[model samples]
Target: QTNPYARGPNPTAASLEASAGPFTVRSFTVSRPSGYGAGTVYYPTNAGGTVGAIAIVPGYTARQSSIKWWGPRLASHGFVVITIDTNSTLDQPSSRSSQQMAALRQVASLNGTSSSPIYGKVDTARMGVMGHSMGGGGSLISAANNPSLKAAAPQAPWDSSTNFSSVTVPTLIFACENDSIAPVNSSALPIYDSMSRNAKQFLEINGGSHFCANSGNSNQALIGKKGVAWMKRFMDNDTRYSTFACENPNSTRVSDFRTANCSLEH
Candidate 1:
């Protein structure tokens, strides 16, 4: 299928920024069908047609505020984005996975409801999931559980189990070199290495902490660019983003990087 997410000519990471894209962003709140509180949906006001959707969840004990910046970052680049809260502040990876899917399902429902502002604005079949820390691990679990997911990106993910060999969805793992909370070797690295059957990429940021990619962080611009590129390449099957997704990171900022099948869709 043609890449529906690719718009304009030769789009670059800088062009996908909040104020640089062709479309303006519009946001609204939705009552959670199965989570702790309301969910926020961000979509491109002039995307011209339906677009892929992504659901983002924050880490354990963190709320939507932790990862909400991704809403506008992705929405402005031709995708619908949803940031959700869990049923509890301390929910584990499994629970977070369930809530994340619930959020995506809610987005799908909004696309079908004529009264909703986002009605017919979402491409439910092309969906992605992302999160931070425990919620990041849950994003991986959600991908493993729902093979239909187009892509998965987890930032500084933490989980007790690392055997996600069954995950067939394309995945991008963001690792922090100095993350004391969820050490890269024990958490992020293992999960990325375990996904042997699908396209995957591991990006380790130099001198980064657990919240390195969160909103207001020093590395938000770089991280946001990579995250959006990955989603566009995989979820939307847009090869135009391949260079961003597969290219080696700048040595000055990236401590380590690795990829498998990043240049081609699986």
Candidate 2:
């Protein structure tokens, strides 16, 4: 199988900062489908061929702006990125899980719609899920229920249940040391610990709040770099990113880190 999401020769964090990838980014809106609300899709203009896709959602009471940076960040690097607004901001993790999958389905549908700009550009078989807080927990549920997901990354995830032991998808849990909303010990850590069936990683940002991975954070570059690497390594099955994905964060800003099967590609 060919890796559609493999990074081109220019793939690098500096390239992301320069806003100069091998492709140009284009954005459009996706209508609210049954079981979910509206979403914004960002994709590459010249990826040369089909690419993987990922669906991201925000935390409780948050709108798309909370996690929208991921749109261009991932799309420009060679993937279709959709950031969705839940039908209700107060929706729980279970509801979020459903909505996130719904959004991904919508993105997949765009690939076959003749009138859609994204038609034929998305490799629906290569899909991933990401979110923040409750939305992050919902991403876990989505992965546990949908075994076909290529990868999952939950930032400061929170859920009432901790039995995600069945999730075999590669997972990356981004924890914040100072997140009062979803404490590391109670939320992110537990989830990372319970994912016993697949490759997993835990990254704790020192002194970070619940929104450490969100826009405007000082560590956004570091977070985005790791996130893209994780998605590429797992979702794209690109081995070039294995080092970035598995290497321990040596910065003093990173409080804790752990990984399983970090050196191996799934």
lDDT tens digits, residue span 208-253, model 2: 9899998667886778888888998899888877877777968898
Q: Rate the local accuracy (lDDT) of all candidates.
A: 0.86, 0.87
lDDT of 1 by residue, 1-266 (tens): 66556654567656754333566889988954655455899988867667899999999889999999889888878889989888888999999999899889889888999998899988789999999999999999999999999999999999999889999999999999999999998999988999889989999999999998888887766787788888888887888888887777666789999999877322
Candidate 2 clashes between residue pairs 3 or more apart in a chain or in different chains? none
Q: Which candidate number maximizes lDDT?
A: 2
Error of 1 at 9 (Å): 4.1
How many collisions between residues are there in candidate 1?
A: 0
Please state the error at residue 56 of candidate 2 in Å.
0.4
| Each candidate structure's count of clashing pairs | 0, 0
What TM-score would every model get versus the actual structure?
Answer: 0.94, 0.94
| Per-residue lDDT of 214 in model 2 | 87
Over 4 Å off in model 1, which ranges? 1-5, 17-20, 264-266
